[PDB]
Amino acid sequence: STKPALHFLDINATEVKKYPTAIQDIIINRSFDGMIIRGVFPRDTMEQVARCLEEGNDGGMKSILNKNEEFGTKVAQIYGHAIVGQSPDLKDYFASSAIFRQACRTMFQGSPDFEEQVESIFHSLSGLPVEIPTGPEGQTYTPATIRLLLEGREIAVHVGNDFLLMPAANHLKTLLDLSDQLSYFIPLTVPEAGGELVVYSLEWNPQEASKYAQMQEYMDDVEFKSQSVAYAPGPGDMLLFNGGRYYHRVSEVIGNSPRRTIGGFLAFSKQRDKIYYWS
Template sequence: MGNFFRIETVDAEGPLPGTAPLAALRAGALHAVLLRHVYPAQAMAEAVQKLDANAPGFVRSDFPAAFKAFFYGLNLNLAAPDLAPYFAAEPAFRAALAGLLRPDAETRITGLLQALDDGRRYCAAPGPHPGARYFFTTLRGHGTGGFIPPHFDNESALRPSYRHLAGLIDPGIFSFVLAFSRADAGGALEFFNLRAEDHAARFRNVDGPSPPPSVEGVEKVAIRLAPGDMVVLNSGGYLHRVTPVEGPQTRWTACSFMAPSLSGDRVLCWG
């Protein structure tokens, strides 16, 4: 790992630490927390078979075409400002996700995050109307050549689709990535020693085919998660990207954005 990069590793199958590494991450003392064995590798292999065929019947949406990737679920960053279709699709996605893994992904993930953050509650962000809620996560499939360009997640709150959510959250966004499968090669999550407060404007909203600014020579670390492992990282405050996937194996992940609520009593999650 790079000299700048501070990470704590936790075995999710063993006793959890008495410290609160996610509180340390939010305070800037850590860049990432790696959770090993959130799910057994065999459970993820069985889930990948279902995902490849979309056996659960997830609603599908797409990254910009240049990225050669897609979502199961609707991603808030790419949603239209009128979020009625987004909220209408959430209950069916939630039900399909609940049947994909045992224990179900939302229960397993929020339980671990809460335990690593001094008991602070983690939950899907509430929507603007009674009973509505944001997608807890989305599932991402990156095919051959699929990638995500360098970006800071804090820029997301500037998008029109965040008009309601931005009024609920602290601006310090972080995220988790849970690996279902690993690409044959490539598909690494690269984390750069570039802070949003100094460089965000140069990388803002690089969603299309135009090349982003060069990151050649910038200090970085590369993370390739094993199936069943999960990383939580300060993706709002630091530049990061996904390198192009090589080979026919789809890179399947679940990814969520998170931020403390303005009330300070919980952390809100969304896909």
């Protein structure tokens, strides 16, 4: 057998219209588990946005950089508050999201715009309208956050469907289909080595995972019972995958060129007639 642990497609962004039910196929039919979509953004756009962040002409994006220094020396830094990290009132989250959307729009200079381009892809892959959710008092969710992984840094193993048990999700649970959520991200800059997305074929099992202080130890126990795939998309490629269902991590960055990625999550509306995307 030459079957890998998970089934991913690999397409060029110019071809997304040939896959008008891909989102349905991942979430509903489970006929594959993810896709790499090459060239969603030009490499030149990725270099210019990265230079904005490096040099600080970033539209204010540096004002919402969370260095996560309290959480130790292995953790990612993040521009914007991700919703998984938040209290159920979401006040600070919605304020960061406003800053993020304006800064992001300024850095991409419409060439192409980040939100327009990502929405184009998700529309093509579903046939559905695509929206960033609105909060209950008219706030904006953020479409994305930017993760910054320096040398030696990683994103520890986690699984997206845990969000459905967090109080921060209360308002989104009034809008979303409560089946799997997908993850999407696009690298802005890639490291010399390491910084791979590792997706396990182990599926969401919150009762069992909860017995471990470290979720990595759970993965290591199941490995004792061909159990994962690793991906390193290049700049401007989108990785879209069933992060809700499958445990996943990002491996440690090797070398002094940081890994910078912009992305978030997506899911159907309750009636599966719209796609919502956020971080």
